[PDB]
Nucleic acid binder design. Structure first.
Ligand code: ZN
Lengths: 59, 207, 176, 145, 38
RNA sequence: GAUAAACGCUGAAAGCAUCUAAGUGUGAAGCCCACCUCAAGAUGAGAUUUCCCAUUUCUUUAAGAAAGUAAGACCCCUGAG
RNA sequence: GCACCUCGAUGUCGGCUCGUCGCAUCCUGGGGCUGUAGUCGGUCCCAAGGGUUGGGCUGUUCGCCCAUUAAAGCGGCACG
RNA sequence: AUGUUAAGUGGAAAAGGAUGUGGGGUUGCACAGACAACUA
């Protein structure tokens, strides 16, 4: 799961560690299992989430 | 450069002008024919394909006749390639005869050595025997196979096996005489191979 | 640099073309070119040049000194040219000149032959003197150290080929 | 034993790429090429399947070596005959036979089993600016790493 | 040439240099003094 | 051909001197070729010349099965270089 | 020196046959210094491609001797 | 973010040797002219 998430996030301008920090600073609690499942099936949902993380650590 | 294919007839003797006796080897070479010309644009290098020794026609097949047809000859028994010869100067159909060489003409000579079969380390490699008396049980054997530490035998440990039958060339021999109406060259010394076996003669590489 | 700061002022005939790196001094004999570096730059107001240095480099001065020395040499030579003179001690030795063929006779069981490239010449007046003449400072020096290399000088009688000012030390070989 | 995707043999498309090797140090270029051949940049990555892309490396003659590697880094080989080490090579490979160079660097950064050996047959390396593979329509990759 | 791990100027005219990573002494008055550290 | 010890040429840092940092050479029975032999199972399996060119039912039409053949090869017999 | 290892078994030295590797180089190749005139040498540096002998006496290595040679190297490999 | 190392040091070893480079100090001699180089 972690390697698939890294692969997907680097396509949205992030890396794995910065995106995990961003999701924690926003209070999102998705598994790494559902995150990878989204990364392969629903790219638009994965981008919604990556934008929320990018705005969280923009402070 | 210069080079021809022939067959081995045998050895004889001859006296010179001054009156010295000299051992010799007769080689017979009826005219060789150029069958193909290889170039860089087509093949990637430069060479010449030569044939020797006409063959009866029940003994060849249709692909061979097609290959020999563009040169207007009978099917051949021996086909070799001759390299490092300024192409030009050559074309399919030409005949190379023994007057390509003249007396003098230090030359190289190649053949395939006689066959001898399964032979031991003493005849095959020049290894020495063990003692024949004095309580000995070690006459005609190949030696110790190595030391203990590597737990195996190294490569090029030499042993028994099939001897002879390899190709060998001998360098810097002399042409003693050339006879044109008979297609014969006389070479000073001995050559490798048996009688009726294929022989190749080229001008020498070390000049 | 004290060398890097000094002045090069070009006598008559000099033209100095610029193209990126290359410089090409020309004069009344030759038209030498040499590749120089970026971090030291050209100059204006003909019949004078200085070079300059953006500081803060570690060594702070080396590249500067060489980049000026070489240009001063090119000018000094393209207007004037350089000279190297070789002597000959060692009784029985002689040189002779035939175009670009320098023939030498030094104790050997064969004469020795040297040939000079484009920019260079030879000048043998006598069986003792040789003179190497060119524009380059490097090539003339290399060719003279080539010639003197055929037979350096011994110390017990000082025979052999020497630069025309070499100070050789002399030993006392006993008489047996 | 539940739902995580796993890819199949001929299901995930493989694209062709062109990478340019003038002034990139040997190992940095080689690390990036090695990750692209294994498919690590695609979320469909599964380890018992091959999903990497193909890579063309161009201008291998101008690859960079820092320090004194061009004279002091040496490649050894043994012929398995007694006393038969061959230490013949140095940064002479970069002059003559610069494909050997790139290939032996990339080969040591891939797994050592039958999948990693089959992923090595997608590298095509060229000493000059031109490749013979224009019918596969390859896209340019740009390195900054 | 002397090759020793102690390389020392031993008259007036001796100089020390570094032609590679290698210390050397070089004297124009006495060729016995020439030295290279090793 | 590129090098080891050694020896330079030009040259500054360090107005001089200095084989070295930038540039430029010489130099060993050693190293890579040069000579001889093996080598495409080099699964990265390479190249050139020549020779040969279509019946039957269908699972379904598919890199389908089965049958008789071309060029060529082999079994079997006389042997030896 | 020690006693980890092997006591339901790990057979000692010289010679023979067959070698291979290190370099702290015995010869041959290239060099700097000399209290190096030449012919021979001393010593230090680079160099492992190839070469490195037959007898007498002792079970003998080791050793001494005889006649030669460009030279008659020193170690590891279960003191192969 | 700010520096150091050029030795593949990092990624085995000492007495001793050295104009390798970074930082901090103590001073002799310097425009009533220094060190070096060239005349006499
Ligand atoms: Zn001195």
């Amino acid at each position: 799961w972690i390697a698939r998430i890294n692969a997907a996030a680097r396509m949205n301008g992030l890396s794995y560690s910065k995106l995990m920090h961003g999701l924690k600073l926003a209070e999102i609690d998705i598994n790494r299992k559902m995150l990878a499942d989204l990364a392969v099936n629903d790219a638009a949902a994965f981008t919604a989430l990556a934008e929320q993380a990018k705005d969280a650590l923009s402070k | 450069t210069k080079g021809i294919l022939g067959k081995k007839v045998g050895m004889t003797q001859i006296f010179t002008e001054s009156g010295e006796l000299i051992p010799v080897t007769v080689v017979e070479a009826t005219p060789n024919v150029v069958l193909q010309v290889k170039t860089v644009e087509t093949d990637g290098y430069e060479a010449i394909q030569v044939g020797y020794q006409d063959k009866r026609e029940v003994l060849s097949n249709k692909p061979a006749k097609g290959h020999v047809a563009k040169a207007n000859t009978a099917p051949k028994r021996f086909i070799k390639e001759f390299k490092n010869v300024e192409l030009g100067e050559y074309e399919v159909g030409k005949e190379i005869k023994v007057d390509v060489f003249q007396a003098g003409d230090v030359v190289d000579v190649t053949g395939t050595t006689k066959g001898k079969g399964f032979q031991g380390a003493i005849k095959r490699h020049g290894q020495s025997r063990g003692p024949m008396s004095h309580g000995s049980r070690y006459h005609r054997r190949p030696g110790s196979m190595g030391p203990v530490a590597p737990n195996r035998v190294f490569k090029n440990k030499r042993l028994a096996g099939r001897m002879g039958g390899d190709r060998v060339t001998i360098q810097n021999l002399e042409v003693v005489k050339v006879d044109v109406e008979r297609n014969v060259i006389l070479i000073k010394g001995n050559i490798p191979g048996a009688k009726k076996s294929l022989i190749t003669i080229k001008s020498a590489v070390k000049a | 640099s004290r060398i890097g700061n000094k002045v090069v002022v070009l006598p008559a005939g000099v033209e100095i073309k610029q193209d990126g790196n290359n410089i090409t001094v020309k004069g009344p004999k030759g038209e030498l070119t040499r590749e120089f570096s970026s971090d030291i730059k050209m100059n204006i107001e003909g019949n004078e040049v200085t070079f300059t240095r953006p500081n803060d480099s570690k060594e702070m001065k080396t590249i500067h000194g060489t980049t000026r020395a070489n240009f001063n040499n090119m000018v000094v030579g393209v207007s004037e040219g350089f000279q190297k003179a070789l002597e000959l001690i060692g009784v029985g030795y002689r040189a002779q000149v035939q175009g670009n063929k320098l023939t030498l006779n030094v104790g050997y069981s064969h004469p020795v032959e040297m040939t000079a490239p484009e920019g260079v010449t030879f000048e043998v007046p006598a069986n003792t003197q040789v003179i190497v003449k060119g524009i380059n400072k490097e090539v003339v020096g290399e060719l003279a150290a080539n010639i003197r290399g055929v037979r350096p000088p011994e110390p017990y009688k000082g025979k052999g080929i020497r630069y025309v000012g070499e100070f050789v030390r002399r030993k006392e070989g006993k008489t047996g | 034993m539940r739902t995580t995707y796993m890819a199949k043999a001929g299901e995930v498309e493989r694209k062709w790429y062109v990478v340019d090797a003038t002034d990139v140090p040997l190992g940095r270029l080689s690390a990036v090429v090695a990750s692209v051949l294994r498919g690590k940049n695609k979320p469909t990555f599964t380890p018992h399947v091959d999903t990497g892309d193909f890579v063309i490396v161009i201008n291998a003659d101008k690859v960079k070596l820092t320090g004194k590697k061009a004279t002091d880094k040496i490649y050894y080989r043994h012929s398995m005959y007694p006393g038969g080490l061959k230490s013949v090579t140095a940064g002479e490979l970069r002059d003559k036979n610069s494909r050997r160079l790139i290939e032996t660097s990339v080969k040591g950064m891939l797994p050592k089993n039958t999948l990693g050996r089959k992923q090595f047959t997608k590298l095509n390396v060229y000493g000059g600016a031109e490749h013979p593979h224009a019918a596969q329509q390859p896209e340019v990759l740009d390195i900054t790493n | 040439m002397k090759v020793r791990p102690s390389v020392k100027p031993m008259c007036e005219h001796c100089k020390v240099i570094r032609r590679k990573g290698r210390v050397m002494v070089i004297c124009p008055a006495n060729p016995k003094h020439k030295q290279r550290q090793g």
